[PDB]
Design a protein around this ligand. Structure first.
Ligand SMILES: [Ba+2]
Length: 483
């Protein structure tokens, strides 16, 4: 048959239900539970890999279970299941400590993650250099060492537990040395980042958290879903190097590792695989032309990057693209100074056609919307949007009402899907803002039905020129009656 989400009932996988779950978790110390619905295609896509991991994992006295939520709603509510599939790890035979699996749903990724969960949250050692030399680490290593006080120790363990799948935690206690808290980063293992001893402070878990959010990031690692939130959680701008092959990345690693060490505290730098993630470039409003270097200020949502080819030039490009070191270096220091121009996404300005409705792009938006001789209505839209299309004939008859009788009003539309705009970012579409004047507040976002009269009255009531479009509409109608 075609592949189903439920595992074959004779496999290593264990079927768990409302009345059997608790007894099962609390007699088994490490359990991966899949909360699924049979109608779910991603649940079907992963079943073969789930079974293949469950097999590989019997060996280790670690269970993989399945709960079908369409039959176990009580259970799915109790575990707060948001969607399918949901993979939860129950540890220590306790149905109240679970964590989410968020990694690749492949057999190999699932067995690796589950074996890790059997390992202690803290490595308790005396010989620390042996420990650090023996393992090739892929994540930062958080080490407490020296004379460790009880209060800090509790915080440390609590963090080891909370951050179990983010960092490795080591306790190298030595009552003859001064306390240290250190981070070892994978590229610079012979050179820890040591906390700056407000020691009473660092046993506060918030102080501890904030320190980690910034300091416990590779200087120049690879970004992806598993780790993106960590870069966002630092609170700091993100530099992206898009690369299209590992040999090409290897050319940029030394410069970006230096730039990263230099500006650690100020921004981050990540490598990002163009083959896997080229798409993301438009998200940074860059062209998909790699390698590329861009900076995203996430807090401000401004985007910056190094100039690229026009799409014409690029399509006649017989050469590898190179980013010059100096241009990269230049943009970084400019960005961090405040000198550096964000990139604004825009369609080509329209040659424009016989509509009274002005079609704006991100390029020409401000000039026109700002102009003090106005009252400017802008409809922000997407063509992916029924309601915006619904409105079209109303928006057109509103534009015609004014075009006929006055120049004191501009009625305009911008496709937000294809054009950045600043200061006016309501989530959905349609969104409508009225710009009355360059010595007038904008704070006139429209709420209401998009009815013609609501819109006429809006412009009338909140417009600098008090243009009474209703009256004016009534006029046209009588004059059309040859009157
Ligand atoms: Ba002791």
């Amino acid at each position: 048959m075609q592949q189903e989400a439920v595992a074959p009932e004779d496999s290593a996988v264990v079927k768990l239900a409302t009345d059997s779950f608790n007894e099962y978790i609390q007699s088994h110390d490490l359990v991966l539970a899949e909360f699924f619905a049979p109608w779910c295609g991603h649940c079907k896509n992963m079943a073969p890999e789930y079974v293949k991991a469950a097999e590989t994992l019997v060996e280790k006295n670690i269970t993989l279970a399945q709960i079908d939520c369409t039959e176990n709603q009580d259970l799915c509510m109790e575990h707060n299941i948001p969607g399918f599939p949901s993979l939860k790890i129950f540890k220590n035979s306790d149905v109240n400590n679970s964590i989410d699996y968020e990694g690749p749903r492949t057999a190999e990724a699932i067995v690796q993650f589950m074996i890790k969960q059997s390992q202690p949250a803290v490595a308790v050692v005396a010989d620390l250099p042996a420990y650090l030399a023996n393992e090739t680490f892929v994540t930062p290593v958080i080490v407490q060492s020296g004379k460790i006080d009880a209060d800090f120790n509790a915080t440390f363990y609590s963090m080891a537990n909370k951050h179990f799948n983010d960092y490795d935690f080591v306790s190298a206690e030595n009552a003859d040395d001064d306390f240290k808290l250190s981070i070892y980063l994978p590229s610079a293992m012979d050179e820890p980042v040591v906390y700056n001893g407000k020691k009473a402070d660092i046993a506060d878990a918030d102080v501890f958290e904030k320190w980690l959010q910034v300091e416990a990031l590779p200087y120049f690692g690879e970004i992806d879903g598993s780790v993106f939130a960590q870069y966002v959680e630092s609170g700091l701008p993100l530099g992206y190097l898009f690369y299209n092959d590992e040999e090409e990345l290897e050319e940029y690693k030394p410069l970006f590792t230096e730039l990263a060490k230099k500006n650690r505290g100020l921004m981050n730098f990540v490598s990002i695989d163009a083959r896997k993630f080229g798409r993301h470039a438009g998200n940074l409003n860059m062209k998909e032309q790699f390698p590329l270097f861009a900076i995203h200020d996430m807090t401000e949502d401004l985007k910056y990057g190094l100039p690229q080819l026009s799409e014409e030039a690029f399509d006649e490009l017989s050469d590898k693209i190179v980013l010059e070191s100096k241009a990269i270096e230049s943009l970084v220091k400019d960005f961090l100074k405040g000198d550096a121009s964000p990139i604004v996404k825009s369609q080509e300005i329209f040659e424009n056609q016989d509509s009274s409705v002005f079609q704006l792009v991100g390029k020409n938006h401000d000039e026109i919307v700002n102009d003090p001789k106005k009252d400017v209505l802008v409809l922000y839209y997407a063509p992916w949007c029924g309601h915006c299309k619904r409105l079209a004939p109303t928006y057109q008859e509103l534009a015609d009402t004014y075009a006929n009788a006055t120049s004191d009003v501009l009625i305009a539309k911008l496709d937000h899907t294809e054009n950045d705009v600043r200061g006016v970012v309501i989530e959905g579409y349609p969104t409508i803002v009225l710009y009355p004047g360059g010595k007038k507040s904008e704070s006139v976002v429209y709420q209401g039905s998009r009815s013609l009269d609501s819109l006429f009255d809006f412009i009338k009531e909140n417009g600098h020129f008090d243009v009474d479009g209703k009256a004016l509409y009534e006029e046209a109608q009588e004059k059309a009656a040859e009157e």
